[PDB]
Amino acid sequence: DPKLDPNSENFSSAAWVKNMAHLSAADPDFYKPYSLGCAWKNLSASGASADVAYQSTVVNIPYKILKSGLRKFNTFQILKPMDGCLNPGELLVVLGRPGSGCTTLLKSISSNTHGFDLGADTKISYSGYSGDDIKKHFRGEVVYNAEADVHLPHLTVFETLVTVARLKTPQNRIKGVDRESYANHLAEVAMATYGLSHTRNTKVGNDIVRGVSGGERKRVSIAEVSICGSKFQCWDNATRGLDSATALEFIRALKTQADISNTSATVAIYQCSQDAYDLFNKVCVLDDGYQIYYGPADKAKKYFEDMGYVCPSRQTTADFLTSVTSPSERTLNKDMLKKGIHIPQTPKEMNDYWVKSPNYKELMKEVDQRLLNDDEASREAIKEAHIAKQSKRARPSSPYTVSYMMQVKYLLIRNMWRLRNNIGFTLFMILGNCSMALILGSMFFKIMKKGDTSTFYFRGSAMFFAILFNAFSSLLEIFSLYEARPITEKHRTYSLYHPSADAFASVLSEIPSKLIIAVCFNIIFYFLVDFRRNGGVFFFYLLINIVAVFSMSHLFRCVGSLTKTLSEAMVPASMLLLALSMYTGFAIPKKKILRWSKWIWYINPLAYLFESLLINEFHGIKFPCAEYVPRGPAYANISSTESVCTVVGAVPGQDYVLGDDFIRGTYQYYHKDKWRGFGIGMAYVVFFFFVYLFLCEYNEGAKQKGEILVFPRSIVKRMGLSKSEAIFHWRNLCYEVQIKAETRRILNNVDGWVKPGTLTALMGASGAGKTTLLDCLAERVTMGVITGDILVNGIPRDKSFPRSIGYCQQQDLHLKTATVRESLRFSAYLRQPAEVSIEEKNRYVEEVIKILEMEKYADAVVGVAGEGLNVEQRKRLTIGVELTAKPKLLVFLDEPTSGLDSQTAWSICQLMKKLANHGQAILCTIHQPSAILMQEFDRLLFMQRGGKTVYFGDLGEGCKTMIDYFESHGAHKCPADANPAEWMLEVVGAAPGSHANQDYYEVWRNSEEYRAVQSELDWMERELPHEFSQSIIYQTKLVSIRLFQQYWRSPDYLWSKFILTIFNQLFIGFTFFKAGTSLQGLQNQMLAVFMFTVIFNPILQQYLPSFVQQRDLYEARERPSRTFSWISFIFAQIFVEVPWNILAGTIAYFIYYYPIGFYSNASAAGQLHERGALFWLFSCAFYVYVGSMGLLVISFNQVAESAANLASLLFTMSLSFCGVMTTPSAMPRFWIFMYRVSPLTYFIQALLAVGVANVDVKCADYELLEFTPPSGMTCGQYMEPYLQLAKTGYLTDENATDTCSFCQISTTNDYLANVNSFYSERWRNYGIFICYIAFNYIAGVFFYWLARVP
Ligand SMILES: Nc1ncnc2c1ncn2[C@@H]1O[C@H](COP(=O)(O)OP(=O)(O)OP(=O)(O)O)[C@@H](O)[C@H]1O
């Protein structure tokens, strides 16, 4: 009964673990009990130095790389020599100020040391194993839980836990159960023993996606680590966000499992009750890298008090130890100074005192024997116990409990759950691909039916374009590879599974979509374009199409797994797409690919597959010639030696134009075998699948290096408020949200007020509606429906309210790059009243910097959590960013003091009390406040599970009023030495495994205190005494400057965009270097312009994820706070992205226009200086337009994948109805509508016109067709009748009679007009194109308001 984990009425973790120990001790031969500790000598770590740390940026990256090479061909020492031994079954607790080396120590002992590197002197021993042998075989018996709560935002809690449970279900589990049931039950127990059972089906969420609360997210990570069952745990920062009851229960769970299962655990906790601290066996203290004390937990005070300090009567032991490391709170023994004995004050001298202290001697006496202890039996049990723990067929020398294919199965189920969550994008993929099949099939339907020479070109074009559209679609899979990277790194550290298992699982998860897409697209396309013979001919094409799809998908995944970000991937991706575009053998045939760059043909899968497809679609099938050179009624009695078939490879004077001869000529595919393409294609598919798996596992990573300070080069190289009268009050506030089709009410009749000249706490268990209440009050709720009335002075809050409060998120939402002082300055400029000059605002910002003690890092770079700024620094920045705003009605504080050292907690509480004394009304939420913090609070609002008020009234001088209230209505007396803040939560039963004697919500509702507060509120309802601060243009200026500094100082995006343009356009231009002006040369000069636009997809998609990131950050904190309106945000995006695109187009001009030879045509025609300028303008316009389209598509999409797909689909529609794809003369139906409206039409017509217009052609011998004219007549007289209707010329020999060679076209204007391209049209095209850009930005600005703005 007490161990059925879904039975919340009775479940008791201790019972479950004791029972499982009784079961696992029953047959030690089968369960193989074992033990694991450690012991370390002279542990020292060192890392980078300020001489090399800088804020990388576009200008400095080249020099930075050069100096990095020099560095490879004064390192900051972080952990100065340490020691200690940790016997199995004994907890260890690490204490120190934030920045003192705690997490680095934990990472060091658990052989998880990415980033820094240990000293050569260090010596670690996991009871016989060296550090490396843990990585090589047993990584999994030593688990480090980083402070960062990293999860997939959308995967619910139960799925998150059950996946790892599955992955860790041992063999030799209870010898009566199957794998699935055991995994499910293990997940249920793990999530019931940590109070997570009511979040069974809620999104784990993240700092942006609203899901489980921060404390619940931390507990999800704790439970995930717990399910593992490792015998050595290191908890980086366990109690960040946990209340003072759940934290105690977590520590008790560790103690229980340690004393029952010989587990060891080293937990670095920053605030811990006196009773919680009593549970630990060994204590470690750190100060700026030095080890001050290591030994029994209970002797800590008895040892430090011997040094010369003294404990205040109401300071807990852990707070005392942390205090000794702070020069302010520390207190010296006045008597001992009188005696003349010195007392170490600086960390170095405390280390000197300790190393000389006897305690260090008895520490060494035991460390040495554990490090020198080798029995060849202790490590035998671990080996025997481990291999027995694995699946039947797993490799014994592997650190993963379950073999490969099982890992793939479970990760595949997880990825299928991800697909379920994102079903919208995949459904869009399928629908859009089908619709593009039906659209392209429509652009040819009525043409192919002719069966004459018309098929020899159009069917090939349609085939090539279907393949290239498949290529475009495959490029969208790069987006998937990046979401799960941090999570797979996390799981790698636990040795759950091979990363290649996750890669394989992603591939499999995507296969079904690709088969459905391929079969539908191919059946439709074939049914209305190609040969239409439903014999095996069709099925062969189906096979080759699917093989091409798979080959492209694997190639793109393999290249996209070479980088750290999507933007960096797009450089390989664009190069590869472009190569797979031109070099397939239809764009530019084999005989034509220049000798300079030939090798790309052979390495091209699509080239071989297209060769096979053409063999299929032309071998042994004949069509009749059309389009003879001399035609019309002017000729009769023609002769075989007197007419010519314009189709290349045609037999002379005969209609038997066999397809074999065709392909032999045009594409040189003269070989017989069609199966060649299939084999080499499948070889590519398999080989690159294996390369992708190797790349994602053996040489891939996304791990953070550490909280280093960046300090941009420009800096390092040179190195309250007045009164407000309005009260704030609310009543009956009730809030309900929808989960799994079953709504849950998370606030219930919460009523209370906060009025000026007061400082009102807000405590309650994690999972109570603290943050939910605050959001409901600050107008930040996004889902559900609130009821009841909030007010200000008895009037509903006006539109000016959201800016008049100051609300500090419990999550830290700031730019990666904007420095601290810069962030404060930005906020002060935009939010503080406009009547004060910038000088005053800047002075006040510096005053805040002084007040909050940030000066020694005011210029650092915010960076990412876990990567660029400590937790204490990040929280101080988060509250300063709002102090500087000068709020005028309230100041909320969601978590001003949670998860950071007790001394800094007290400092922030002193700041809060000062502000409240000055006049501000504060309402802060508090977790684990020591008794010395509770004495600063004036009122208290107390919440039960489910967001039910359980107290609201004064705390009193010594917390007397709340104590009296709770004891007055029935509750066990609070001990004199007990902390009131913790006794109160013990009574309410906030602990996951504990329940109260009665439901105190009813108690409160029935109390005279509740009637008192209700009467207060009713009276105060009888009370009686712009949206943004700055002008819209001003805030637009500021946000645009910030975003310019954001693209600057963010090299991965701009520098990648350049590299992409540079190399891509270089590749295009040189593929078509100086194409000439012949028929085949002119064809290349048309293709190059036509191929200039294929880059639309990758260059557009580089931008989308960056914009998604800025949009998430903006709408997370700065939209509800009304720092600057949405229109300002969009205008900043536009004004910042434009000029960079202009520069990109400028460079593309110079690296593209000249090599192809356009300048030669412009100069020969005598119009150089105009055509150069016009071509430059069109390049700039194209790049601006690509940016604009990227902005338009993303405006109304939550996900970049769907937006990118929409952009690619629109691009393909605009492109298929363009160029020579289908001659506009051949499409007189209504489908011309998209032709006239598409922008690629105007761009390409204008660009061909400028590039190749008004110059003469020079046919080469291989292109000159020839015929023998009628006897006696001369060629000129014989062709003049044709010429009057032909409006062409270039007859080779006018007066010859035996034979004359001819060219279909004489003036290039003829060829351009053939595609409806005109030189006189150039300017109107530019006007239309810029108008399209303008409309596109108008629609992009509109759709944001339509969709994202509430
Ligand atoms: N990889 C690194 N290279 C150089 N210095 C580092 C590195 N990581 C951290 N530091 C520096 O070492 C000091 C201590 O960092 P530490 O790893 O102890 O963070 P912490 O105190 O554990 O904070 P948290 O508990 O939030 O991780 C910091 O001042 C930081 O600048």
Ligand SMILES: [Mg+2]
């Ligand atoms: Mg919260």
